[PDB]
Amino acid sequence: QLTPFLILLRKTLEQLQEKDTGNIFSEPVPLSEVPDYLDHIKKPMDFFTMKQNLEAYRYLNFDDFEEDFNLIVSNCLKYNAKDTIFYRAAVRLREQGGAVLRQARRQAEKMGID
Amino acid sequence: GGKGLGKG
C-alpha cells in the first residue's frame, strides 16, 4: 500500500543522505558553473530532486527509486576525475548506500511491491 | 571517453 511504502522511501532517502557526510549530492550540480556537465551526463540527479519526486508521488515502486539513487552515484563517477573528492565520495556512497538499498528492498518486498 | 573539466 502507498502510505507505508512512501514512509519506507522517506526513511531510506534520509539514510542515504546521511551517508553523504560532505553533502556532495544534496543539490543538482550547478550547470552554470559546470557548463560541460550535460556533454557527459544524460540525466543529472541529486537528493533534493529525489525528495521532490518522492513527495510528488513519482516513485510508485522500488525500482524507480533505486534507479535515481544509482544515477547520483554513476553520474559522479562518470563525470569527475578519479583523484577528486567527488569521485571518492561516490565510491564510498555506492558501498554504503548499496547496503541501505539492499535492506530497504527487503522491506519493500515485505509490503506490497511485485 | 574523456571526462569533463571538473566541478572545482
Side-chain angles (χ1 to χ4, degrees), chain A residues 89-112:
Chain A
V91 169
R92 281 192 316 270
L93 186 57
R94 166 166 290 168
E95 195 161 349
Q96 295 186 310
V100 170
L101 284 178
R102 199 152 55 235
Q103 182 179 7
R105 177 170 285 276
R106 288 189 43 175
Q107 282 304 117
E109 290 166 11
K110 283 315 214 164
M111 303 178 179

mmCIF file of all heavy atoms in Angstrom, chain A residues 89-112:
data_model
loop_
_atom_site.group_PDB
_atom_site.id
_atom_site.type_symbol
_atom_site.label_atom_id
_atom_site.label_comp_id
_atom_site.label_asym_id
_atom_site.label_seq_id
_atom_site.Cartn_x
_atom_site.Cartn_y
_atom_site.Cartn_z
ATOM 1 N N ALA A 89 33.981 10.269 -2.943
ATOM 2 C CA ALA A 89 32.687 10.268 -2.259
ATOM 3 C C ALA A 89 31.672 9.341 -2.916
ATOM 4 O O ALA A 89 30.907 8.662 -2.223
ATOM 5 C CB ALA A 89 32.126 11.681 -2.183
ATOM 6 N N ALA A 90 31.641 9.321 -4.248
ATOM 7 C CA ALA A 90 30.742 8.423 -4.973
ATOM 8 C C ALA A 90 31.114 6.958 -4.778
ATOM 9 O O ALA A 90 30.236 6.088 -4.690
ATOM 10 C CB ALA A 90 30.693 8.770 -6.471
ATOM 11 N N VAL A 91 32.410 6.671 -4.711
ATOM 12 C CA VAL A 91 32.837 5.303 -4.446
ATOM 13 C C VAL A 91 32.328 4.857 -3.073
ATOM 14 O O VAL A 91 31.798 3.744 -2.924
ATOM 15 C CB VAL A 91 34.368 5.144 -4.537
ATOM 16 C CG1 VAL A 91 34.791 3.772 -3.996
ATOM 17 C CG2 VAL A 91 34.846 5.352 -5.988
ATOM 18 N N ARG A 92 32.484 5.727 -2.077
ATOM 19 C CA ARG A 92 32.037 5.421 -0.717
ATOM 20 C C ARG A 92 30.520 5.298 -0.645
ATOM 21 O O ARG A 92 29.992 4.373 -0.011
ATOM 22 C CB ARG A 92 32.519 6.469 0.291
ATOM 23 C CG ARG A 92 33.972 6.309 0.724
ATOM 24 C CD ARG A 92 34.286 7.192 1.925
ATOM 25 N NE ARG A 92 33.715 8.526 1.769
ATOM 26 C CZ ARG A 92 34.346 9.550 1.202
ATOM 27 N NH1 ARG A 92 35.582 9.402 0.742
ATOM 28 N NH2 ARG A 92 33.743 10.728 1.101
ATOM 29 N N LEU A 93 29.826 6.228 -1.289
ATOM 30 C CA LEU A 93 28.368 6.225 -1.280
ATOM 31 C C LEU A 93 27.788 4.979 -1.960
ATOM 32 O O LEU A 93 26.749 4.458 -1.532
ATOM 33 C CB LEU A 93 27.822 7.496 -1.945
ATOM 34 C CG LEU A 93 26.295 7.672 -1.877
ATOM 35 C CD1 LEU A 93 25.820 7.647 -0.417
ATOM 36 C CD2 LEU A 93 25.842 8.960 -2.571
ATOM 37 N N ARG A 94 28.439 4.510 -3.025
ATOM 38 C CA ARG A 94 27.999 3.281 -3.682
ATOM 39 C C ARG A 94 28.034 2.110 -2.695
ATOM 40 O O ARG A 94 27.106 1.293 -2.650
ATOM 41 C CB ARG A 94 28.867 2.950 -4.903
ATOM 42 C CG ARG A 94 28.667 1.517 -5.427
ATOM 43 C CD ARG A 94 29.257 1.334 -6.819
ATOM 44 N NE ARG A 94 28.480 2.066 -7.831
ATOM 45 C CZ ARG A 94 28.891 2.267 -9.084
ATOM 46 N NH1 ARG A 94 30.086 1.812 -9.491
ATOM 47 N NH2 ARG A 94 28.099 2.908 -9.933
ATOM 48 N N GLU A 95 29.099 2.021 -1.906
ATOM 49 C CA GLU A 95 29.204 0.914 -0.958
ATOM 50 C C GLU A 95 28.227 1.055 0.203
ATOM 51 O O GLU A 95 27.494 0.118 0.537
ATOM 52 C CB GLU A 95 30.633 0.734 -0.431
ATOM 53 C CG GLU A 95 30.808 -0.622 0.252
ATOM 54 C CD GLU A 95 32.258 -1.057 0.394
ATOM 55 O OE1 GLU A 95 33.143 -0.424 -0.217
ATOM 56 O OE2 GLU A 95 32.509 -2.044 1.121
ATOM 57 N N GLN A 96 28.214 2.232 0.816
ATOM 58 C CA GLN A 96 27.378 2.451 1.987
ATOM 59 C C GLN A 96 25.900 2.528 1.619
ATOM 60 O O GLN A 96 25.047 1.934 2.295
ATOM 61 C CB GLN A 96 27.822 3.712 2.726
ATOM 62 C CG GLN A 96 29.216 3.593 3.315
ATOM 63 C CD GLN A 96 29.589 4.792 4.158
ATOM 64 O OE1 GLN A 96 29.452 5.935 3.724
ATOM 65 N NE2 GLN A 96 30.051 4.540 5.374
ATOM 66 N N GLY A 97 25.605 3.254 0.545
ATOM 67 C CA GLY A 97 24.247 3.373 0.039
ATOM 68 C C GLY A 97 23.711 2.057 -0.478
ATOM 69 O O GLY A 97 22.519 1.771 -0.356
ATOM 70 N N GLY A 98 24.598 1.265 -1.075
ATOM 71 C CA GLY A 98 24.255 -0.062 -1.550
ATOM 72 C C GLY A 98 23.701 -0.950 -0.448
ATOM 73 O O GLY A 98 22.719 -1.670 -0.665
ATOM 74 N N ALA A 99 24.320 -0.900 0.731
ATOM 75 C CA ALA A 99 23.838 -1.664 1.883
ATOM 76 C C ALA A 99 22.456 -1.178 2.332
ATOM 77 O O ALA A 99 21.590 -1.982 2.701
ATOM 78 C CB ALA A 99 24.840 -1.602 3.048
ATOM 79 N N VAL A 100 22.266 0.136 2.313
ATOM 80 C CA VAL A 100 20.982 0.728 2.677
ATOM 81 C C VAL A 100 19.890 0.237 1.728
ATOM 82 O O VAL A 100 18.845 -0.218 2.169
ATOM 83 C CB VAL A 100 21.040 2.278 2.671
ATOM 84 C CG1 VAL A 100 19.631 2.882 2.812
ATOM 85 C CG2 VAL A 100 21.961 2.790 3.790
ATOM 86 N N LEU A 101 20.155 0.310 0.425
ATOM 87 C CA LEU A 101 19.185 -0.114 -0.579
ATOM 88 C C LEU A 101 18.867 -1.607 -0.528
ATOM 89 O O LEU A 101 17.737 -2.000 -0.793
ATOM 90 C CB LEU A 101 19.654 0.258 -1.989
ATOM 91 C CG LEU A 101 19.524 1.733 -2.382
ATOM 92 C CD1 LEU A 101 20.068 1.933 -3.793
ATOM 93 C CD2 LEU A 101 18.085 2.199 -2.293
ATOM 94 N N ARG A 102 19.867 -2.435 -0.231
ATOM 95 C CA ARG A 102 19.660 -3.868 -0.035
ATOM 96 C C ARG A 102 18.633 -4.106 1.082
ATOM 97 O O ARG A 102 17.702 -4.911 0.956
ATOM 98 C CB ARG A 102 21.008 -4.493 0.334
ATOM 99 C CG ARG A 102 21.151 -5.986 0.152
ATOM 100 C CD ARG A 102 22.632 -6.361 -0.122
ATOM 101 N NE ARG A 102 23.576 -5.887 0.898
ATOM 102 C CZ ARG A 102 24.653 -5.126 0.674
ATOM 103 N NH1 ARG A 102 24.969 -4.705 -0.550
ATOM 104 N NH2 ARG A 102 25.424 -4.771 1.694
ATOM 105 N N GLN A 103 18.824 -3.408 2.197
ATOM 106 C CA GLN A 103 17.952 -3.574 3.352
ATOM 107 C C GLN A 103 16.558 -3.029 3.035
ATOM 108 O O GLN A 103 15.542 -3.634 3.389
ATOM 109 C CB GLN A 103 18.551 -2.873 4.572
ATOM 110 C CG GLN A 103 17.714 -3.043 5.841
ATOM 111 C CD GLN A 103 18.317 -2.366 7.052
ATOM 112 O OE1 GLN A 103 19.309 -1.647 6.952
ATOM 113 N NE2 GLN A 103 17.710 -2.588 8.208
ATOM 114 N N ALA A 104 16.518 -1.898 2.334
ATOM 115 C CA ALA A 104 15.240 -1.248 2.041
ATOM 116 C C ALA A 104 14.430 -2.098 1.069
ATOM 117 O O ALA A 104 13.218 -2.239 1.226
ATOM 118 C CB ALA A 104 15.465 0.164 1.468
ATOM 119 N N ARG A 105 15.108 -2.652 0.066
ATOM 120 C CA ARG A 105 14.458 -3.560 -0.879
ATOM 121 C C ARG A 105 13.813 -4.735 -0.160
ATOM 122 O O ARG A 105 12.679 -5.107 -0.471
ATOM 123 C CB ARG A 105 15.436 -4.058 -1.949
ATOM 124 C CG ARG A 105 14.808 -5.082 -2.933
ATOM 125 C CD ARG A 105 15.724 -5.375 -4.121
ATOM 126 N NE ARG A 105 15.747 -4.275 -5.093
ATOM 127 C CZ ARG A 105 14.836 -4.115 -6.055
ATOM 128 N NH1 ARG A 105 13.823 -4.975 -6.169
ATOM 129 N NH2 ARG A 105 14.926 -3.097 -6.898
ATOM 130 N N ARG A 106 14.520 -5.312 0.811
ATOM 131 C CA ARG A 106 13.943 -6.407 1.593
ATOM 132 C C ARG A 106 12.685 -5.971 2.335
ATOM 133 O O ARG A 106 11.751 -6.756 2.495
ATOM 134 C CB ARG A 106 14.958 -6.985 2.578
ATOM 135 C CG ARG A 106 16.051 -7.805 1.921
ATOM 136 C CD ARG A 106 16.859 -8.511 2.973
ATOM 137 N NE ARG A 106 15.984 -9.082 3.993
ATOM 138 C CZ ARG A 106 16.406 -9.844 4.993
ATOM 139 N NH1 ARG A 106 17.695 -10.131 5.098
ATOM 140 N NH2 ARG A 106 15.539 -10.320 5.882
ATOM 141 N N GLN A 107 12.660 -4.727 2.805
ATOM 142 C CA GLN A 107 11.470 -4.206 3.492
ATOM 143 C C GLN A 107 10.314 -4.034 2.517
ATOM 144 O O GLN A 107 9.160 -4.358 2.834
ATOM 145 C CB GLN A 107 11.756 -2.857 4.149
ATOM 146 C CG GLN A 107 12.503 -2.935 5.441
ATOM 147 C CD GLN A 107 11.804 -3.806 6.461
ATOM 148 O OE1 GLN A 107 12.344 -4.817 6.871
ATOM 149 N NE2 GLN A 107 10.599 -3.416 6.876
ATOM 150 N N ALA A 108 10.636 -3.505 1.340
ATOM 151 C CA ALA A 108 9.653 -3.262 0.290
ATOM 152 C C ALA A 108 9.021 -4.566 -0.159
ATOM 153 O O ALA A 108 7.822 -4.613 -0.444
ATOM 154 C CB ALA A 108 10.304 -2.536 -0.895
ATOM 155 N N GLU A 109 9.822 -5.628 -0.207
ATOM 156 C CA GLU A 109 9.297 -6.956 -0.529
ATOM 157 C C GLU A 109 8.263 -7.411 0.495
ATOM 158 O O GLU A 109 7.283 -8.077 0.153
ATOM 159 C CB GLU A 109 10.425 -7.988 -0.603
ATOM 160 C CG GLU A 109 11.347 -7.804 -1.826
ATOM 161 C CD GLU A 109 12.627 -8.599 -1.696
ATOM 162 O OE1 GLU A 109 12.702 -9.440 -0.784
ATOM 163 O OE2 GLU A 109 13.564 -8.373 -2.487
ATOM 164 N N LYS A 110 8.487 -7.051 1.754
ATOM 165 C CA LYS A 110 7.590 -7.464 2.829
ATOM 166 C C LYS A 110 6.251 -6.740 2.779
ATOM 167 O O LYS A 110 5.271 -7.185 3.370
ATOM 168 C CB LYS A 110 8.261 -7.272 4.188
ATOM 169 C CG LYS A 110 9.285 -8.342 4.498
ATOM 170 C CD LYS A 110 8.713 -9.715 4.156
ATOM 171 C CE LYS A 110 9.213 -10.801 5.096
ATOM 172 N NZ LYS A 110 8.369 -12.024 4.985
ATOM 173 N N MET A 111 6.220 -5.625 2.065
ATOM 174 C CA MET A 111 4.986 -4.886 1.865
ATOM 175 C C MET A 111 4.216 -5.424 0.668
ATOM 176 O O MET A 111 3.771 -6.574 0.671
ATOM 177 C CB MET A 111 5.280 -3.400 1.685
ATOM 178 C CG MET A 111 6.051 -2.802 2.841
ATOM 179 S SD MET A 111 6.440 -1.065 2.596
ATOM 180 C CE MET A 111 7.299 -0.710 4.131
ATOM 181 N N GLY A 112 4.073 -4.601 -0.364
ATOM 182 C CA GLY A 112 3.205 -4.959 -1.480
ATOM 183 C C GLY A 112 3.822 -4.763 -2.863
ATOM 184 O O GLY A 112 3.103 -4.787 -3.864
#
